[PDB]
Amino acid sequence: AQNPNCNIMIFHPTKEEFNDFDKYIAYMESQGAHRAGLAKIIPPKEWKARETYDNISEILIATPLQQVASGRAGVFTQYHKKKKAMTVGEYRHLANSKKYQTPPHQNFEDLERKYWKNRIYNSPIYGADISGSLFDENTKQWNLGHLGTIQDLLEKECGVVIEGVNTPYLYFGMWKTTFAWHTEDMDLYSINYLHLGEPKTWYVVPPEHGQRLERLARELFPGSSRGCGAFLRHKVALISPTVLKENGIPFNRITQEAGEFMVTFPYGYHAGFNHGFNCAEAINFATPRWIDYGKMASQCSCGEARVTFSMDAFVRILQPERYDLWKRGQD
Numbered sequence: 001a002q003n004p005n006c007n008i009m010i011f012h013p014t015k016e017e018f019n020d021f022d023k024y025i026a027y028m029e030s031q032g033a034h035r036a037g038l039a040k041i042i043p044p045k046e047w048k049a050r051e052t053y054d055n056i057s058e059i060l061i062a063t064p065l066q067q068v069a070s071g072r073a074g075v076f077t078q079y080h081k082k083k084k085a086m087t088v089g090e091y092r093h094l095a096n097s098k099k100y101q102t103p104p105h106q107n108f109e110d111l112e113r114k115y116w117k118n119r120i121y122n123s124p125i126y127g128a129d130i131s132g133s134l135f136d137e138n139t140k141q142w143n144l145g146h147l148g149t150i151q152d153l154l155e156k157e158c159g160v161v162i163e164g165v166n167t168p169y170l171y172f173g174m175w176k177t178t179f180a181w182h183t184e185d186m187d188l189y190s191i192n193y194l195h196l197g198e199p200k201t202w203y204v205v206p207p208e209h210g211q212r213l214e215r216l217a218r219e220l221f222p223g224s225s226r227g228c229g230a231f232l233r234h235k236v237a238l239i240s241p242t243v244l245k246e247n248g249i250p251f252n253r254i255t256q257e258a259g260e261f262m263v264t265f266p267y268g269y270h271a272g273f274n275h276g277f278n279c280a281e282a283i284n285f286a287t288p289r290w291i292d293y294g295k296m297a298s299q300c301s302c303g304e305a306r307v308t309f310s311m312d313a314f315v316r317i318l319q320p321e322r323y324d325l326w327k328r329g330q331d
């Protein structure tokens, strides 16, 4: 078995290898990359996402989210308070202000220490989940707006044609902005490109160990667990690396820098934080190997998780027994 310790693997495809997206994902899996739940892909030196980032300031963040924490430094939840709209140029100036800017630090490990010590005492503002793309239309390789759709993959594997669409989302971050522990909708893959700015640190649990994280989460968030049998779908819970280590949970960590892609694999729990002002693009995708994960994915039916239009068909076709309860949670 390749990669039996489930380490995060880093790949350096050539420009030739960067042509065929599906083929390269399958290659990475042939080397065991998926066992980690996360991989890094450094694009060939010849590649670029677009020519410059000098003209993005007028993008609107219609609903910036203030991420307010509750709990203790290493075990907390966050809720998202909606703020007034602002442009990317206004958000960048806010990120760089004394109130929100990255503190002085020695290296990434020092900054990580400071994040986990102090995150809960601040409420950073995240421009998350903005439909759109920063890839140039002329970028033909790894253009996250031009991937094969999940509806086409389901149709190709299973023969059933379904409604729905699959488009990318932009994320504008600042110091301490946080993504809570989660797997993707329907345990899909994700791919994330860091277009510009400061790094993003990731934590990940191997898919074969995801139920160990779920059992810890139920212990640490006992009211939430009584409320919902899949409360991590709410995307609000944080657990620090120190607490994971104290509880024996297998995990790994890595820092993504501007110009790098990350892929999350089906049922790979992940969480993390931004180092300072940045912009990422991400989208879900599927392969043949996902279908079995989609069929087994947990679902939230309590009403909290509320998701896209296109998840309906996935539940309806892959999980017909669960469909009526899930759809009630949607309505």
Ligand SMILES: O=C(O)CNC(=O)C(=O)O
Binding pocket: 171, 178, 179, 190, 191, 192, 264, 270, 280, 282, 283
């Ligand atoms: O960058 C973020 O805030 C969150 N991104 C993801 O969870 C992802 O790409 O799967």
Ligand SMILES: [Mg+2]
Binding pocket: 055, 056, 057, 058, 059
């Ligand atoms: Mg603009």
Ligand code: NI
Binding pocket: 182, 183, 184, 190, 264, 270
């Ligand atoms: Ni994700």
Ligand SMILES: [Zn+2]
Binding pocket: 227, 228, 229, 230, 231, 233, 234, 300, 301, 302, 303, 304, 305
């Ligand atoms: Zn729920």
